[PDB]
Design a protein around this ligand. Structure first.
Ligand SMILES: CN[C@@H]1CCc2c(ccc(O)c2O)[C@H]1O
Lengths: 333, 288, 233, 54
């Protein structure tokens, strides 16, 4: 245990020595984005109960949402129509994902099983493709590496890489002390980071299977995770009111986003297409928009009767849709 | 004297403004926010719409009559205004009765209440209430079934400069019953049952947690709900039934004063049926 | 062209299906079976039956849905059970002298305090089942570990003036039962603000009338919620 | 026992890495944001004619 303490002290000393100047100092001369006003262009209605997860399709037109009613609805954002409505075996759902090819939709939750639904099937409109089992905890978040590979983050404090065709875990990632609550894939899909309740965000390498870096940051749990569009940075959403941005190469936090008035937690974090705006939800009914490079609040998104539990920015950056516990999906622009 | 007329006009204008502002604010709060859109709030907005209609049509023209002492508009407009007045009053009172019945079903049968009330059912109930209110007002007034065969009444119906209310026994009794007396009985039985339920819940709580620190509120709320409806409208319908029998003469001023006391119930209603914290937050967001 | 008509038809069919599902979902209540291990949750669950475990039972033509979860002290899935009709809390009242290191009853009290003061589970009433009454009676009646030895406040405790006993009972077992009950009730009363209450029940493995108790507790919960919503309570 | 050795090895693996100065990383993030600011519909108000949702 003495060697571990020495290694941790050496890592902290190296990080402190590497920090030349804070990102706030360098971005002083950058002009602020100014006040941003956003309006609810379209509101999606039909969900019976509160909504946890959402995912924007690669086409930037289709999005899928999950609710406790057991209905997994695929919406057409442009026409505000329901393309599909998939029932679920388990009413309690905590995650959902939409495959890049647009043919598969992943779901999971307290059922301890990740379910993949085949949207391409014509004999049956929607049906379960695989029943991915092996986790001993609730699946917090699932994401699609490809049309055949999926990575999930469960309450077993382990993230696993699954193979849909075979139906069994190809690789499992261990090291988190607490439950894993969020997961996001890097654009190249070779790397991904998973936030955990252990107040630490860890970076994983998919092919090697070994943890690479770990960022301490704040002390509360991490509920939301999201990479920068560049792929060399990511931001976390804490149970404390602080949102923090970390850099993989510098291996330390660059800037923390917090306000004196805000005391509630963060449930969803996503970046804009250019990365200039960090759109983060909150336990408070209103959402917030932060200037990533300056930690200056630009706009506030309000209009949800309950807490915001989902948020995402579409691939082309045209719109942002936040799914709150009010059983309503609101698309902003 | 001269000052008295100005004072009455100022009071009437203030009443018109208060009613219009209150009901418009309630309807706007219900419409703007999807949170407030609830099955019981459909009945609430039906009541608010009825109150707004009355305070915009019957109250201003009635004030113009009482100040002017004559009816400047045509003979058709007198009948139309009377029909609008009766329709609005009946719709408001029966909507109060429907709200009471909805609360009775909510507390009395909690399990079945969530199933046998639906948005379609609420719309059907509101449409039926407005249809019942219309048949009592428009059908008799427009087809001259309310007109009574009296010398003074026949003279009044002739000259277009005079527009008062003279009615036969049958229509008066039927309208009074349908508008106020059946809703009174239904509401009294409803609120007695709901008070019994609240009381028994209170003694059950006391039995469960008597030693630890954890019906004034129920009595106060029921008084604020029913007493203001009884006090505002009961005298008017009582004197209606009295002077229609004509066994005890009732002066026209005594009738008009009680009718306007009934009118102000529309303005009073938003302060009674929209005290919820959600409604208060919506009002605070709307204005300042 | 035809794509708009096809989308409209699909949306209309899906909306009708979701309306039927809305009726079915609003017509059914949901409960959470939350309790410490080895406290008899399996036996009581089987009594109502007549990764997650979902059992559906209906009484008086009213559908109840119960979900039992089965992994650490920290609970972040507990936020998923907001708006449930009631939380059923089964405890081993007989376990006042046990190692769960720590007294099992004290661990149950800590769990009750955590559940009561949780921000997400606010406005949710807890149905409390003091399971294993017979074992508690056997322990207290016979010579065994004293309650005062493990719970210091038991020495100053006295039987409440209500003193509602069963048809056959002993003073000592009644004192122990009521002390255990008022511990939970004292934890419950302080933090509550009238939105949610705690319903205590003394039950045993032999008893099979827990369906009626759960039904009555749910009826009272919904009635109290409706009464407080309209400000008559 | 065995867990401590695994944790120590994991910490050793993360310790041996190359870290670039924070100035370079901040410059890279600033350059990326400045370069891609022209193609961000959220940051700058897109015309209503080209906006798909309106
Ligand atoms: C012109 N004033 C009318 C006359 C009779 C009447 C009123 C209200 C409700 C009724 O059911 C009535 O029959 C009064 O507002």
């Amino acid at each position: 245990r003495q060697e571990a303490e020495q290694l941790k002290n050496q890592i902290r000393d190296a990080r402190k020595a590497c920090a030349d100047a804070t990102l706030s100092q360098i971005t002083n001369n950058i002009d602020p984005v100014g006040r941003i006003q956003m309006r609810t262009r379209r509101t999606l209605r039909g969900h019976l109960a509160k909504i946890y997860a959402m995912h924007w399709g690669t086409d930037s037109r289709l999005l899928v949402s999950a609710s406790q009613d057991g209905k997994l609805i695929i919406w057409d954002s442009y026409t505000t129509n329901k393309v599909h409505a998939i029932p679920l075996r388990s009413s309690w759902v905590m995650t959902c994902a939409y495959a890049p090819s647009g043919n598969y939709v992943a779901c999971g939750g307290l059922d301890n099983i990740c379910s993949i639904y085949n949207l391409k099937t014509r004999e049956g409109n929607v049906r379960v493709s695989r029943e991915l089992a092996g986790h001993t905890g609730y699946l917090s978040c699932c994401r699609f590496l490809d049309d055949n590979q999926i990575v999930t983050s469960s309450g077993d404090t382990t993230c696993a890489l699954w193979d849909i065709e075979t139906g069994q875990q190809t690789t499992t990632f261990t090291g988190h002390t607490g439950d894993v609550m969020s997961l996001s894939l890097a654009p190249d899909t070779r790397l991904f980071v998973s936030g955990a309740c252990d107040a630490s965000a860890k970076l994983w390498d998919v092919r090697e299977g070994m943890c690479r870096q770990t960022f301490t940051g704040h002390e509360s749990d991490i509920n939301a995770i999201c990479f920068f569009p560049n792929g060399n940075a990511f931001a976390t959403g804490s149970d404390d009111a602080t949102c923090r941005l970390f850099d993989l190469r510098a291996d330390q936090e660059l800037m923390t986003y917090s306000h004196d008035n805000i005391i509630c937690g963060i449930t969803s974090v996503s970046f804009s297409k250019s990365g200039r705006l960090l759109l983060a939800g909150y336990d408070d009914f209103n959402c917030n928009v932060w200037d990533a490079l300056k930690a200056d609040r630009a706009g506030v998104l309000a209009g949800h009767d309950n807490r915001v539990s989902c948020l995402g920015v579409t691939d082309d950056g045209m719109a942002v849709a936040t799914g709150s516990w009010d059983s309503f999906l609101k698309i902003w622009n | 004297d001269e000052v008295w007329v100005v004072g009455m006009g100022i009071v009437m204008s203030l009443i018109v403004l208060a009613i219009v502002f209150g009901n418009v604010l309630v309807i706007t709060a219900i419409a703007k926010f999807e949170r407030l859109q609830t099955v019981t709030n459909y009945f609430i907005t039906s009541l608010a719409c009825a109150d707004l209609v009355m305070g915009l049509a019957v109250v201003p023209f009635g004030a113009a009559h009482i100040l002017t002492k004559t009816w400047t508009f045509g003979n058709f407009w007198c009948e139309f205004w009377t029909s609008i007045d009766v329709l609005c009053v009946t719709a408001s009172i029966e909507t109060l009765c429907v709200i009471a019945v909805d609360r009775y079903f909510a507390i009395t049968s909690p399990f079945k209440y969530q199933s046998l009330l639906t948005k379609n059912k609420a719309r059907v109930i509101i449409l039926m209430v407005w249809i019942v209110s219309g048949l009592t007002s428009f059908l008799p007034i427009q087809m001259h079934w309310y007109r009574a065969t009296h010398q003074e009444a026949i003279n009044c119906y002739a000259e277009e400069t005079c527009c008062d209310f003279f009615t036969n026994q049958a229509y008066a009794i039927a309208s009074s019953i349908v508008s106020f007396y059946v809703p009174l009985v239904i509401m009294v039985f409803v609120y007695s049952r709901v008070f019994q339920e609240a009381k028994r819940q209170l003694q059950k709580i006391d039995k469960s947690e008597g030693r630890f620190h954890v019906e004034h509120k129920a009595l106060k709320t029921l008084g604020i709900i029913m007493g203001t409806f009884t006090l505002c409208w009961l005298p008017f319908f009582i004197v209606n039934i009295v002077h229609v029998i004509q066994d005890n003469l009732i002066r026209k001023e005594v009738y008009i004063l009680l009718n306007w006391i009934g009118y102000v119930n529309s303005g009073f209603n938003p302060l009674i049926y929209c005290r919820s914290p959600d409604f208060r937050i919506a009002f605070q967001e709307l204005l300042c | 062209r035809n794509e708009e008509k096809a989308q409209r038809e699909a949306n209309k069919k899906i909306e009708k299906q979701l309306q039927k599902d809305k009726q079915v979902y609003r017509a059914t209540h949901r409960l959470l079976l939350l309790g410490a291990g080895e406290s008899g949750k399996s036996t009581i669950v089987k009594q109502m039956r007549i990764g997650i475990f979902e059992t559906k039972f209906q009484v008086d033509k009213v559908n109840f849905h119960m979900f039992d979860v089965g992994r650490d002290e920290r609970r972040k899935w507990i936020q998923c059970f907001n708006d449930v009709t009631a939380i059923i809390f089964v405890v081993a009242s007989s376990s006042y002298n046990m190692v769960i290191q720590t007294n099992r009853l004290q661990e149950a009290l800590n769990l009750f305090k955590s559940i009561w003061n949780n921000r997400w589970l606010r406005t949710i009433s807890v149905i409390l089942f003091l399971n294993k009454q017979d074992l508690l009676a056997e322990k207290v009646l016979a010579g065994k570990s004293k309650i005062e030895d493990y719970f210091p406040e038991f020495a100053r405790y006295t039987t409440p003036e209500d003193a509602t006993p069963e048809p056959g009972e002993d003073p000592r077992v009644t004192r122990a039962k009521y002390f255990i009950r008022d511990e939970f009730l004292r934890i419950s009363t302080a933090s509550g603000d009238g939105r949610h209450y705690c319903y205590p029940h003394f039950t045993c493995a032999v008893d099979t009338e827990n369906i009626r108790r759960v039904f009555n507790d749910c009826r009272d919960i919904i009635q109290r919620m409706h009464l407080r919503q309209y400000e008559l309570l | 026992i065995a867990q401590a050795r695994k944790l120590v090895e994991q910490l050793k693996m993360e310790a041996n890495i190359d870290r670039i100065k924070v100035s370079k990383a901040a410059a890279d993030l600033m350059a990326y944001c400045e370069a891609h600011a022209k193609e961000d519909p959220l940051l700058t108000p897109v015309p209503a004619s080209e906006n798909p949702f309106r």
